[PDB]
Symmetry: C5
Amino acid sequence: GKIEQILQKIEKILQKIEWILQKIEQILQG
Amino acid sequence: GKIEQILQKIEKILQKIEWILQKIEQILQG
Amino acid sequence: GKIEQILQKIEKILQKIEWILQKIEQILQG
Amino acid sequence: GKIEQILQKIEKILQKIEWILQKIEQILQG
Amino acid sequence: GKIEQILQKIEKILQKIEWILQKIEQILQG
């Protein structure tokens, strides 16, 4: 259960990272 | 079962991160 | 037990990565 | 078994991400 | 056992990724 919880936190941090990269890619395009 | 599902979501987020990064690399490269 | 500990270190490194990325985005945005 | 397989896929994607980032680091200094 | 080994490799690549990102951030901020 504790492994699932740490993995869920890792998942959310990675999603946040992907969102920032998306923003960077837009900035770079313009 | 839940661990596998979270891991697969994590895998898919990283694939997307790699893909955006490939695009960022192309932008900077030319 | 050891799996939880390794996952917890991975979580911490990812938080550091997300933080640096937030700052990079801020630099690029301005 | 499936968990190991997804983790090895995750490892390989991170290796590719690291490589793209090295090239970006190099491009940024000319 | 193999799972622990794979996670420790992932942790190591993430450490490498963080260092590159630190350099990139410094290149951009300067």
